[PDB]
Amino acid sequence: MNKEILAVVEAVSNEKALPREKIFEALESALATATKKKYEQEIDVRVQIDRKSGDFDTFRRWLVVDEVTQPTKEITLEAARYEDESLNLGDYVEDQIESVTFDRITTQTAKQVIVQKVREAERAMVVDQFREHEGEIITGVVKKVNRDNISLDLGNNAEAVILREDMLPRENFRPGDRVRGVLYSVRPEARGAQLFVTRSKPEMLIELFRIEVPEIGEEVIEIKAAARDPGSRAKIAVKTNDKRIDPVGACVGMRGARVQAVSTELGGERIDIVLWDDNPAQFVINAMAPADVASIVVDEDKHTMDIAVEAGNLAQAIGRNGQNVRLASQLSGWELNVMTVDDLQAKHQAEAHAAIDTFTKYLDIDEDFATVLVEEGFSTLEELAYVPMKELLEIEGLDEPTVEALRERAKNALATIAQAQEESLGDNKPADDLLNLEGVDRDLAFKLAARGVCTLEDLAEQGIDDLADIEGLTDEKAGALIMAARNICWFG
Amino acid sequence: TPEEKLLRAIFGEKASDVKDSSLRVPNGVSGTVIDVQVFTRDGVEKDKRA
Amino acid sequence: HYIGDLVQRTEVELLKTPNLGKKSLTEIKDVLASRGLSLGM
């Protein structure tokens, strides 16, 4: 009984990483609340449990305060110091009170307070205690399978959840099955499942490789990127700083044994392992494996890459439903356009012809001179308008006067487009008319003006129904713009 | 829900996980209790009403 | 739905409604006035 009380408190601390002191403070508060419930008159109670015997004394607590608002629970500092001169503001004055008999009522109150720290909070405590598992591949037993989630038991009253999106598409779990997964998020749902576990996200692949490949766990090989189509195919990019180690060979292992162990845990998912390169073009060539790349053209401004392949390799480069190009694009971060060598040449010829037509039309130059500008790498009027004068002067046959004239023509061509944007659309002239209505860009102002709504007054006179057919204008956005127009025209 | 393993700290006994319930009686009849008999097998502690 | 709902709304509230122009607001006032009712009762 005496030692049993202390042993029980220690068992609560061990159950869900709690403290003997924190368990006692809570039992004291539980017993105070149980005694206050029994007491008809609501009076503050202070319970103190002896930490060696498990015996407990109950008081009529009197919160020492400066100004008494509740005479049944509060006492003035002057009155408290009349009984004990050592008391300060915030201390408690006591009164010999009969301790509540520990019936199954108090037992239910106190054990629930202890369960609030050793059952619900035990879930959160165990997740935190296992700092490695929180982030790495925790192992759980399937407790319950629902339509939308799987509840895992991790032990120690910790429950985790795998959501339907967090499962592999072909996995079928039964109650009692053992499941591995990455703990990717810890929230605050102590009562229930605060732990979120994934098998579908890329982190599951990374951590499986960390466990199966010692050289990744020892930080000798680094995984730089991972792209994944869960239960079908993945790509990982690996780098090493040690020139004596082949990072691809280390991740594959003897006869593919390591990559096959990871693939088997992922339900037969195909894993491609590629060498990370610091050159984006070389890295994309590696990411496109097993398809052979013939040439790459990089568009840095659009963050896109055109990949030419032999006509025989086109189907392999795209992959089933575009899976290979999509995984390569997700792994590189680049948008990847896969075409034949013939199609790439036809695209470049069409772009060169469109650039020549644009330059001939807007710069008042001959086709021969427009061709020289495109051969020197100029494709846009913006490049010609803004590029450093030194690069334009490196072109054979350009003098400083001709470069200045070409730049002035390029800027004026753009100023002619800006004049239309200002008036015809609504960037300056109609910005204070058709686009005055708050929630209308230059494009919307021109769409309004195409319906005969040319002024802020014309917009204030419209109904939502009159504007409902304008592409990009929702009824709510139409209503907001009409009200903004009315506020300016009728209430300004 | 309230783990009755921490009972040793509060209640005592051992573990009150056993369903606590007081034998309550059914309905259909009113009345007035006129006479109560209590018989005790010898050796058992007589309570205060016996 | 009812005339009693319409009569409680203010003119400023009706102008916030979708597809409600100044012309339709004047029509509603003229019709309510023909029945001896006003907006905002």
Curated annotation (Swiss-Prot), chain A:
Span list, region 2 X 51 AA approximate repeats: 364-489
Induction statement: In response to low temperature. Negatively autoregulated. Induced by cold shock (42 to 15 degrees Celsius) (at protein level).
Task performed by this protein: Part of the processive rRNA transcription and antitermination complex (rrnTAC). The complex forms an RNA-chaperone ring around the RNA exit tunnel of RNA polymerase (RNAP). It supports rapid transcription and antitermination of rRNA operons, cotranscriptional rRNA folding, and annealing of distal rRNA regions to allow correct ribosome biogenesis. Participates in both transcription termination and antitermination. Involved in a variety of cellular termination and antitermination processes, such as Rho-dependent transcriptional termination and intrinsic termination.
Domain-level remarks: The N-terminal region interacts with RNAP. The central region is composed of 3 RNA binding domains, S1, KH 1 and KH 2. The C-terminal region contains 2 acidic repeats, AR1 and AR2, which bind to protein N from phage lambda during antitermination. AR2 interacts with SuhB and RNAP alpha subunit C-terminal domain (rpoA); AR2 cannot bind to both simultaneously. SuhB, NusG and the alpha-CTD of RNAP all interact with the AR2 domain and can displace the AR2 domain from the SSK domain (S1, KH1 and KH2) of NusA.
NCBIfam families associated with the record: NusA, nusA_Cterm_rpt
Name of the protein described by the UniProt record: Transcription termination/antitermination protein NusA
UniProtKB/Swiss-Prot annotation, chain B:
Post-translational modification: Acetylated on several lysine residues in the presence of glucose.
Function statement: DNA-dependent RNA polymerase (RNAP) catalyzes the transcription of DNA into RNA using the four ribonucleoside triphosphates as substrates.
Biotech relevance: Co-administration of salinamide and rifampicin or salinamide and myxopyronin suppresses the emergence of resistance to both antibiotics.
Annotated gene: rpoB
Similarity remark: Belongs to the RNA polymerase beta chain family.
Domain of life where this protein originates: Bacteria
Protein name stated in the entry: DNA-directed RNA polymerase subunit beta
Assembly with partners or alone: The RNAP catalytic core consists of 2 alpha, 1 beta, 1 beta' and 1 omega subunit. When a sigma factor is associated with the core the holoenzyme is formed, which can initiate transcription. The rRNA transcription and antitermination complex (rrnTAC) consists of RNAP, NusA, NusB, NusE (rpsJ), NusG, SubB, ribosomal protein S4, DNA and precursor rRNA; S4 is more flexible than other subunits. In pull-down experiments interacts with CedA. (Microbial infection) Interacts (via flap domain) with Escherichia phage lambda antitermination protein Q; this interaction renders bacterial RNAP resistant to transcription pausing and allows it to read through termination signals.
UniProtKB/Swiss-Prot annotation, chain C:
Posttranslational modification: Acetylated on Lys-22 and Lys-23 in the presence of glucose. PatZ controls acetylation of Lys-23 but not of Lys-22. (Microbial infection) ADP-ribosylated on both alpha subunits by the phage T4 protein ModA. ADP-ribosylated on only one of the alpha subunits by the phage T4 protein Alt.
N6-acetyllysine modification, residue list: 22-23
Domain of life: Bacteria
Assembly behavior: Homodimer. The RNAP catalytic core consists of 2 alpha, 1 beta, 1 beta' and 1 omega subunit. When a sigma factor is associated with the core the holoenzyme is formed, which can initiate transcription. Both the N- and C-terminus interact with different regions of transcriptional regulator CRP. The rRNA transcription and antitermination complex (rrnTAC) consists of RNAP, NusA, NusB, NusE (rpsJ), NusG, SubB, ribosomal protein S4, DNA and precursor rRNA; S4 is more flexible than other subunits.
Cited function: DNA-dependent RNA polymerase (RNAP) catalyzes the transcription of DNA into RNA using the four ribonucleoside triphosphates as substrates. This subunit plays an important role in subunit assembly since its dimerization is the first step in the sequential assembly of subunits to form the holoenzyme.
Entry comment, domain topic: The N-terminal domain is essential for RNAP assembly and basal transcription, whereas the C-terminal domain is involved in interaction with transcriptional regulators (such as CRP) and with upstream promoter elements.
Family (UniProt): Belongs to the RNA polymerase alpha chain family.
Protein name, as recorded: DNA-directed RNA polymerase subunit alpha
Gene: rpoA
Entire-sequence positions represented here: 276 to 316 of 329
